[PDB]
Design a protein around this nucleic acid. Structure first.
Ligand SMILES: [Cl-]
Ligand SMILES: [Cl-]
Ligand SMILES: [Zn+2]
Length: 179
DNA sequence: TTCA
């Protein structure tokens, strides 16, 4: 495979500044007799394109992953913006999850996409569809740096405010999802 | 610098 340019990672996953783009790093994992099987072929990253948000481009590539319906797979997204509602993507993901019940999705967002006035409805719909929605933490940024980025042995260097932003967004998300 |  290949790895993300470090400048692209830092400018798109900084949880204190937005970009007019969305990146999505993904991995697929399976638990077998209590062990983590995570294939290299099931890991990658992508970005949004004109008229197609990143979440939908991940849906586009699921057939190529060749998942087996006899097994449960845990799919994790590290996504620079939380999925939207108004352009249809939360509904598309919900439908996908209902049609592919062997897929269990974890959505870890660096930022909340509240440009969408219906951003709360997106998160609640994804939760209602069985997805585990959370806000990326320090450890998850470091994991993505170490796992998906062409870093060349350089360790993760956190930006100022990372923790303050992450914990603020996590509190926001708790209130959005609380019942 | 909110999927411009
Ligand atoms: Cl979306
Ligand atoms: Cl707020
Ligand atoms: Zn969308």
């Amino acid at each position: 495979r290949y790895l993300m340019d470090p400048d692209t990672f830092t400018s798109n996953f900084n949880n204190g500044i937005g970009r007019h783009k969305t990146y999505l790093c993904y991995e697929v994992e399976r638990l077998d007799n209590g062990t983590s099987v995570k294939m290299d072929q099931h890991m990658g990253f992508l970005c949004n394109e004109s008229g197609r948000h990143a979440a939908l481009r991940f849906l586009d590539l699921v057939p190529s992953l060749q998942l087996d319906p006899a097994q449960i797979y845990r799919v994790t997204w590290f996504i620079s913006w939380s999925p939207c509602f108004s352009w249809g993507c939360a509904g598309e993901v919900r439908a996908f999850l209902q049609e592919n019940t062997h897929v269990r999705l974890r959505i870890k967002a660096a930022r909340i996409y509240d440009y969408d006035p219906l951003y709360k409805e997106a998160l609640q719909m994804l939760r209602d569809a069985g997805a585990q929605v959370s806000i990326m933490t320090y450890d998850e940024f470091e994991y993505c740096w170490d796992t998906f980025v062409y870093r060349q042995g350089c360790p993760f260097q956190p930006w100022d405010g990372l923790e303050e932003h992450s914990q603020a967004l996590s509190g926001r998300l708790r209130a959005i999802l609380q019942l």
